[PDB]
Amino acid sequence: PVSPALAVQQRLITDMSSSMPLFAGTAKVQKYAIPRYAGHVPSFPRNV
Amino acid sequence: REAICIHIGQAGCQVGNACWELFCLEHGIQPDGAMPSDKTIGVEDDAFNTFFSETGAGKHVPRAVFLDLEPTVVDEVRTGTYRQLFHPEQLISGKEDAANNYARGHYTIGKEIVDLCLDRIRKLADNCTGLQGFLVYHAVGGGTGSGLGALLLERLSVDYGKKSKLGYTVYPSPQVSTAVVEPYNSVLSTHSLLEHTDVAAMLDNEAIYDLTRRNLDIERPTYTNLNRLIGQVVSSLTASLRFDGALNVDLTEFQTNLVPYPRIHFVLTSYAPVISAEKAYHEQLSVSEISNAVFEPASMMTKCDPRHGKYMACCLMYRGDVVPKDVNAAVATIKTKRTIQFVDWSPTGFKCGINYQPPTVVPGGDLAKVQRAVCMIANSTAIAEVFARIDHKFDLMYSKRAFVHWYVGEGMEEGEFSEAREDLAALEKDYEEVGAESADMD
Amino acid sequence: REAICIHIGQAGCQVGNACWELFCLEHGIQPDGAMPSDKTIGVEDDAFNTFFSETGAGKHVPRAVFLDLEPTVVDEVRTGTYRQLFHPEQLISGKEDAANNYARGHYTIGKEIVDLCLDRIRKLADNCTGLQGFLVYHAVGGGTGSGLGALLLERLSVDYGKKSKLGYTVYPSPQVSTAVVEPYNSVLSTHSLLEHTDVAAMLDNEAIYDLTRRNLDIERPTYTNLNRLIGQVVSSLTASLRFDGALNVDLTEFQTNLVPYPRIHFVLTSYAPVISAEKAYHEQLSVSEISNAVFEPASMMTKCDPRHGKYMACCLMYRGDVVPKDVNAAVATIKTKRTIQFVDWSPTGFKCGINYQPPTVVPGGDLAKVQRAVCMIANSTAIAEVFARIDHKFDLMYSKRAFVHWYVGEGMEEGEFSEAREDLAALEKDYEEVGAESADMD
Amino acid sequence: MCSVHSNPLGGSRSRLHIAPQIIPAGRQGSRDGTTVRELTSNHYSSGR
Amino acid sequence: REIVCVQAGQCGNQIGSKFWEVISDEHGVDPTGTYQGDSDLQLERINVYFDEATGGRYVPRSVLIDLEPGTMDSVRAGPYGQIFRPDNFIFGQSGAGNNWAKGHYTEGAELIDSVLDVCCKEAESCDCLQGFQICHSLGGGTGSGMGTLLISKLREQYPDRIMMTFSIIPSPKVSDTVVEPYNTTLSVHQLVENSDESMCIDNEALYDICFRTLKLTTPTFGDLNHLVSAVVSGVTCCLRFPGQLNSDLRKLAVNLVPFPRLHFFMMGFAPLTSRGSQQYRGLSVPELTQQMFDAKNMMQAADPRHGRYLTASALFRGRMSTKEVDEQMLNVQNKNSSYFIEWIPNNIKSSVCDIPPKGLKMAVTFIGNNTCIQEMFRRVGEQFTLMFRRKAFLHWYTGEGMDEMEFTEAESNMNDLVSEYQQYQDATIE
Amino acid sequence: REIVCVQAGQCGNQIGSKFWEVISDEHGVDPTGTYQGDSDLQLERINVYFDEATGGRYVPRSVLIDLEPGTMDSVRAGPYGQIFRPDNFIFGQSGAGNNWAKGHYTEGAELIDSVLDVCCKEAESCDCLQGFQICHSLGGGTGSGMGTLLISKLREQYPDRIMMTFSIIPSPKVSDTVVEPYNTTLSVHQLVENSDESMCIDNEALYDICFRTLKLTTPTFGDLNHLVSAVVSGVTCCLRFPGQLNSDLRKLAVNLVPFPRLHFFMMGFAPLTSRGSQQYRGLSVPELTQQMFDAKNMMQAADPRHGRYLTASALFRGRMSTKEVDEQMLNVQNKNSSYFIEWIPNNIKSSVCDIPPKGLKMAVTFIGNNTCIQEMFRRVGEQFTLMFRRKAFLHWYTGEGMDEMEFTEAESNMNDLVSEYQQYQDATIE
């Protein structure tokens, strides 16, 4: 049941990716910022 | 119809935030770029097109780039409230600042980042069908504003050619100062700006502080107030493109009417009904009083005194409920005054504009709501005093080459200082010669 | 209508997994070869026939062979998820690899395996009624891909004759490298491939890495991403066979339009809307924007700069919702550009194709979903720079006979190195001569 | 889930639409019912 | 006997919109184009300004040109805008820049061929063609440059017909544009060669009409453009309705112009009077004649008391005796005899038309040829000479491509026109 | 007096399907083949394009040929596809490869006997045979090569009839195929010997028709093929309906061709006008005549203003006066007299037919013989000379078997055709 909202569409393809563990510590996985972000993003689930 | 905005460095990005908040609130775009889904006015008018393009799903996106060498300000934009409005490619940030060195920005660091900026501007200009100029916001006192502003305007001027380039520029205040090396950066900036700009708008922070103290009753102003005032001025000048009116003014008409000779393009700006909410219900605000107001020295946003010079041209923008007869009576009354003088070679001294859209009220704002406003841009010989003071401060510092080793180590020849100082001296002589009154009777 | 796919070695089989995943998802065949009962059609349709054949019980099976000398990758296909899709006889595997030796694959080991492959290809070609070419996937950097690919193409070219054979080829990247002996294998492969292929498309992993870093936001790409991009390209080129459209394109017209002289058959490939899902909703994607994109070097999948050469022919494939008038306007705008140059002997430089089926979106994929796409194959003199660096690396090693004893032990005369190096020198001279302007009109 | 594509620009065979829940990106073109026989045959559009 | 109208620039298109409102109202044509009139007299000359489209409809024979569609979009959005033929709207993609040279040389020549093609298509459909009618301002950029360009092309293509212009010229007081003197001088140079008869209006005179005569509290451009549309629609009234003494544009030209350069005229319309006073005094020819010669009712800043009348014409609409007309024009000529040039034995032409404008019992429009127009041209030449000595803004025009010799030629031609007016003013017979 | 149609290649089959839609509509034939018309005028000439099959049905006298069945499968799936006789679809098993030599020499000789067998079967069934009609593109591969092969065979077998072709030719701005100049040159070489009359269309001209005149936002190949089907069905209208001045294809040829090589013509169809504008302008013979000669309404990129008319023909459909037609053609010839060749005393033929196409009150199709066609051939010859000097793609054609002497012959013949047009353009009485 995918909603037609914009943010759901933007993040649905990323959520289903087959290389999710390889994206850790990058700007894609930070849901609180637009991509190509510059600040620090944690790479451990306790910090995340 | 279309205009492209380029924001450079810290002052230009912070003023950009105020500009785009204001332009959103006047059109009605939500911070996420979507039109209100419950709004059913039906007359889906084209006025946004000057500043926005549609994706096709009905999201709005703005015609701007944000350029910086330090990450922090762009990361503030990326993490703020307007995250979804901008395309992420549009927000360009480097690794390290230009460290108050014009030389570092122009030669060493800006040279790597500049090609991304040109590729983005090309991608914007290709998605236009009646582009009629660039708006640029920067400060000439800092390193990235000086170096990237010069380099980017030079490249734009070669690639795009005849297209107009209008700059809104924050100059170093005559006694308020923020960094030691401001005179050097302002001289080196102005040398490049002379060749590569069509109109230059002059701002001084001391005037906007004085204006906020005298008219508003604010003892402790901060940058958000100044930036909101600047945004209002830019909205007033660009309103003529966006809404119906009696006397429209296209951006090429500004250049034709304001610039008599190709170097004499630096202009003063002022805004009339800057007033607080408590005062606003005690007074009527007719056309003739605000027309008299824009000529009072308490109104300017640049620290210069116009009583020490002669006007060459004035452009008066009226927006809101105004009738042409009141504009004509006001301009004729101004013309009668004895303390307002025009150069004798300019008999028809005035340009008028009349627009129906009243000024917008911003939810957190400090200005009152008013039915009419007038905004003025004017060309006057008084501006020569600002350059004379920058050049005097340069001569004091340059007598000992006080900091020059940084600039020469970071890549600049010492000769460039003397060339720029002689060019600004020649600009002073140009303002001396144009203001000469001569008798052809001979 | 029908096409047969031949997959050789490691890169070719791994790219094959992504290709057949995609072709299944586009037609709707489940991984076990059974069409679901819900995928009904109002009228009976044949589009699957290009890639699948039915046994009559309604299972689907694909027109492909997987060829390898090492078992591991084919055993991986046999034990994976797609076990039931392939016929087990189609999956042929040897005992031991060609150990990066072209000589071992061509002379020693492939000579045993080649007759089974020929029997399978014959068994496929007998179950056809309009076979119209071979698609071949291999890398020229490794031993079995070069040696067995050449030997098999030679046998196919004698047995089948005039039928067209189109190759997709992974060439050694210009500074990323994986093995020491890559130049020798690539030169010796290219010597055989020159005579026995009609068009060869060149790929470099460094370009697809750059594309996945720059356009997509992937910091750590892996081979599955590259193989999915290649699969998308192949689906775009073969879509013209499979779905309705305004301007269809059969595989023989590619050979007729792109190859001017029989040796000048190496082509560049690019794909336009490689874009992430978050970027895709901030921007419109009109015809003219993607047409302008495919000519920018940021869109290419091979590491060469076309500004250092001249185009001879371009073939532009549009799929999705596109109308011919915008394609015509776009191509005329491209023709206007000054940084795009065609040889003066090729005035009618363009071929167009237009198909109605938009590109498919794969559930685990990294590309966004988009309504239209364009794919380009183009012939350009810039490719001569790619060969020159391989030839320089060959000259560096061969001046001291750096590794030759391996090749001589597995069955090759030393003379074969000099012959191949002279053939590549002649190919360089051909690219010098074709690009010289003819101006002797007197 | 799958559906059947429409045929606005031509064609006669049915086409398969894959995963309609994902909303396509990019601008949808401007369309209208104005065709060439409506213009070259329907002169009686107004009964004045 | 059909007229083709051209509306150019912002001022011209707005005044034209008001003109077509007034004319469509007078002939009872609904904004859908349907005839809804109430007398055959309305129908029998509808052809003069309208062409007939199929099943009832009428379309107005006018071409609209502008460089940015903003004005075009505003007129199309107006209440009568739908009547105009879609193919008749011509617009570019970039502005005149308030620059005459840009409007004449760069964007002008790009569009101008399509305007002549439309004008020829419209002209060749007429069974017999009378003169053209053009509305534009002289102080603007596209108005001045393209108006005079189009006038030159139409005078080349139709030299035996009449060329008529209505033109707005800069007030000495209302400075709306800094570069007004250049555009005015170059446009008057083009007009005095090209035009057959040219009418001039000052916005200041319309303001003084509104404030003093009509006592309007808050006038707007709709009122000024209504006054202009009233005189414009009045001059042609005798072309298209019966009367006791018919008149025609060519007959007007023959009676008003003594020598071919002296063809610039003043306009007036008489029964302007506020709604409160009108109940206390009925209209009559002495009253109309008194308003008709009062300078308060004249649409130029120059005053008749500083010049002399060469010729004048009055066209009366309404049911009235010819005897009163004849004796009023004789009595006015005899009583004020020093202000009329003495070597013409009778300076006033009269004309009488049966059909007045709706809601007025009678009306007259007055056209006057007076030497006081020389003071206006002298003022424009003065402002040009002040500006030209210092090269004040010339680089824009030179960058478009104009030779400086054009400015000295145009100045010389205007100075000779002023001198010629002054010479005929002060001539004497011994 | 019955015509046999041949449709070849993708363009030809697509235009043909739409043509037979238009023709089946005009005669009221149901897609089942049953006659359902509502006037005897439809039935009494149905034989011209249809043969009658048993128990009601009518079948259209057309042969469909292509080298790959993809197009035929698309047309068979269409709404009228069932009407076509199954035995009339002839197809091979591999494509033309966009190569003229392949299409003419290798698969051509393989298929040609079965197409000729079908064409003879259709021809010998006629009681009296009129000319053949062929639709194809000249830039393609099977269309150009196999179309001209079939044309040559039919000209051998029926040399006394007329051979007429409608042909699509490469645009001046963007190519759809790289090797277009060779295929065009060889096809024009075949046509100028074999053909009696050849019609030419530029896709760029149809795009400009749609955008400027019809203002379509998103035109498609269906619209272009409808315009072509409209003109094709219009040329034959006088063959198959009554009228005040009947005309015939042979009568057209006799009046249009002054000398046997000068047989390439431009086409147009007049009452094209956008849905927004249609409320503003009624149909009349002056309006149709004015639009008919406007180069905007001509379906080729060359413009008449750069050439001269040798001859022209206009076929009018509808109830109209002969006086308006003759006097309009005289007035147009007199006013533009410099553009008509002076040693012919009257260049225009007219014809009038009583029955217009349904839903139009009147229509005209225009055929013009103008010397500006020389610019297209000159452009193609230039591109050929650039390609031929460098042997740019020649090995494909030589590998099929062509001698280069064919290429030099075709180039020389095209250059002589251009010279002949230029010589007749500048001829004089002396």
Ligand SMILES: Nc1nc2c(ncn2[C@@H]2O[C@H](COP(=O)(O)OP(=O)(O)OP(=O)(O)O)[C@@H](O)[C@H]2O)c(=O)[nH]1
């Ligand atoms: N009005 C206004 N002025 C500002 C603002 N920020 C800085 N300034 C002024 O601009 C000048 C400093 O220029 P900066 O923008 O800091 O220089 P920069 O672009 O950051 O260049 P770098 O220091 O090399 O990064 C001083 O005169 C400041 O007073 C602001 O937010 N609003």
Ligand SMILES: Nc1nc2c(ncn2[C@@H]2O[C@H](COP(=O)(O)OP(=O)(O)OP(=O)(O)O)[C@@H](O)[C@H]2O)c(=O)[nH]1
């Ligand atoms: N894009 C892409 N490149 C690959 C892939 N697998 C291998 N390569 C590249 O191809 C080259 C190696 O060729 P291989 O396919 O491993 O050689 P081979 O066919 O296995 O030959 P042998 O080693 O003798 O078995 C290197 O440049 C690799 O980077 C792949 O799956 N995708």
Ligand SMILES: Nc1nc2c(ncn2[C@@H]2O[C@H](COP(=O)(O)OP(=O)(O)O)[C@@H](O)[C@H]2O)c(=O)[nH]1
């Ligand atoms: N009476 C009247 N004058 C106008 C109107 N609009 C503009 N003007 C005047 O015309 C002059 C400006 O010319 P403009 O029409 O803008 O020239 P353009 O730019 O070439 O179209 C100024 O004197 C304005 O006061 C109007 O609607 N009515």
Ligand SMILES: Nc1nc2c(ncn2[C@@H]2O[C@H](COP(=O)(O)OP(=O)(O)O)[C@@H](O)[C@H]2O)c(=O)[nH]1
């Ligand atoms: N007007 C029109 N032109 C077409 C159509 N289909 C193809 N063309 C044009 O014809 C040329 C291609 O020739 P084509 O029919 O493919 O040759 P073939 O391969 O031998 O059948 C190009 O210029 C196309 O633009 C169509 O349906 N209508």
Ligand SMILES: [Mg+2]
């Ligand atoms: Mg900073």
Ligand SMILES: [Mg+2]
């Ligand atoms: Mg291996």
